[PDB]
Amino acid sequence: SGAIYVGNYRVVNRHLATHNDWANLVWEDSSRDLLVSSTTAQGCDTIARCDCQTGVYYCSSRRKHYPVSFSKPSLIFVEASEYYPARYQSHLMLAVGHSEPGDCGGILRCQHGVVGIVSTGGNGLVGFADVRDLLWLDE
Ligand SMILES: COc1ccccc1[C@H](NC(C)=O)C(=O)N1CCC[C@H](C(N)=O)C1
Numbered sequence: 001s002g003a004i005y006v007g008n009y010r011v012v013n014r015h016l017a018t019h020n021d022w023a024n025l026v027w028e029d030s031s032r033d034l035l036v037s038s039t040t041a042q043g044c045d046t047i048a049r050c051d052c053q054t055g056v057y058y059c060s061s062r063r064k065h066y067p068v069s070f071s072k073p074s075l076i077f078v079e080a081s082e083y084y085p086a087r088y089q090s091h092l093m094l095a096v097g098h099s100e101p102g103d104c105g106g107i108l109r110c111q112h113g114v115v116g117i118v119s120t121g122g123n124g125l126v127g128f129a130d131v132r133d134l135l136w137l138d139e
């Protein structure tokens with residue numbers, strides 16, 4: 001679990017959005033596993049606007065942060081789960097690092113701010129949904 005809170009927005013994994021997230025929907029994209037909802041309070045996070053390929057992510061299944069080198073956002077095949085059919089997920093960045101079911105929502109940050117959130121994983125891999133192209137989160 002986990003979310004990004006920026007301005008009057010909350011960014012979560014679409015497959016983990018709550019009834020309240022859907023009732024206050026701003027934007028969602030099943031192909032990216034993202035959903036943004038509106039909030040009444042001002043957020044705590046700021047968003048990176050960069051091309052960094054290294055950073056640090058939070059891994060809830062280890063209660064620890066780990067450094068990672070990650071690929072550029074791209075279209076990557078993701079096998080079927082209880083939440084989605086087998087499909088291509090877009091704006092996804094892969095890295096080598098621990099992740100297991102439950103780790104979605106952990107934030108990935110570089111020196112410039114929030115880069116994205118954990119969205120996929122498996123066998124020593126971790127995939128992050130990028131948010132750096134969502135320029136409207138800042139306005
Ligand atoms: C962090 O996720 C994992 C990590 C290691 C192993 C497995 C997983 C997850 N598999 C299960 C069965 O929970 C996983 O990758 N996803 C499930 C939730 C939706 C995700 C998506 N973006 O399509 C895909």
Ligand SMILES: [Zn+2]
Pocket residue numbers: 048049050051052110111112113
């Ligand atoms: Zn950066």
